[PDB]
C-alpha cells in the first residue's frame, strides 16, 4: 500500500530535470510514473525543484485549497513546473499530453508527521 507522501513524489516530483525540454516530456513521464496504467490521468504537474525545497513549502504561507479546505501552502518563491494536459485526440489505451513548462508559485496540500505534501493543488 503506497504512502500518500510517496505517491505525491511519484505523481508530481522531477528533481532530476531543471525543466521539460521536449514536447513529449509529459507523454514519456505520465507513462513512466504509472500515470496512464489503468486510465489516462487527465492533468498532472511535475515540479523541477529539490525534494527539500518542495517539502519546505509546508512551512510557508497557509492558503485555502481550491475545494476550499485549508491545509494548503503556497511557495514563497517561484518554482519550475511542467503542466501536462491530455490532447483532444488522447484516448486510453493510447494517451497523449500537451507539455507546458513555466516558472510559477505552487500550492500543495500537506499532511502527517513528517508534515509533507500529499496533493498538488495549483500554481500561480
Amino acid at each position, epitope marked *: 500500500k503506497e504512502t500518500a507522501a510517496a505517491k505525491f513524489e511519484r505523481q508530481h516530483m522531477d528533481s532530476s530535470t531543471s525543466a521539460a525540454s521536449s514536447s513529449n516530456y509529459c507523454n514519456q513521464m505520465m507513462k513512466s510514473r504509472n500515470l496512464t496504467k489503468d486510465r489516462c490521468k487527465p492533468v498532472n504537474t511535475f515540479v523541477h525543484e529539490s525534494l527539500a525545497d518542495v517539502q519546505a513549502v*509546508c*512551512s510557508q*504561507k*497557509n*492558503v*485555502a485549497c481550491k475545494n476550499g*479546505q*485549508t*491545509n494548503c*501552502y503556497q511557495s514563497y518563491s517561484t518554482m519550475s513546473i511542467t503542466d501536462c494536459r491530455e490532447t483532444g485526440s488522447s484516448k486510453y489505451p493510447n494517451c497523449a499530453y500537451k507539455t507546458t513548462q513555466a516558472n510559477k508559485h505552487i500550492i500543495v*496540500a*500537506c*499532511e*502527517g508527521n513528517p*508534515y509533507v505534501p500529499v496533493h498538488f493543488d495549483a500554481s500561480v
Partner: nanobody
Amino acid sequence: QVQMVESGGGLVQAGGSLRLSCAASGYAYTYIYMGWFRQAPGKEREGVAAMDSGGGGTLYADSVKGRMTISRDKGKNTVYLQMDSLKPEDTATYYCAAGGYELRDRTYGQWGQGTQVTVSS
C-alpha cells in the same frame, strides 16, 4: 522555528471550569485554522474544537458540545478554550494545533507538547 506555547491546564474539581490558551510564535503569516485535540491515557488522540482566522467555521466534538467554547483573536495566531461542567471523561493532555482543516488530525502541521488536565470526581 515556530514555537507553540500552551497554558491554563492543571487540576480542577468535577463540574468546575478551566481556561486554556495557546499562541503560535515565529510563524510569518496567519494560520487559517487552529484547533484543540485531547489524548487521554491509553487512547487515540481526538478532536475537541476548531475555529478559523475570521471567527467562523467553528466546530465542536459530540462529547463536549455545550460545555466548551473556542475563541480566537481576529486574524492572529492565538486560540482559547473555555471549558466548563468538566468531568473525569475530560481528563487528558489537551493539545493545540495550527495549519490544518477543521478537526482532521492529519491536516495540522504544528503541535504543542500539551497541558495535562486532571478532573477529580
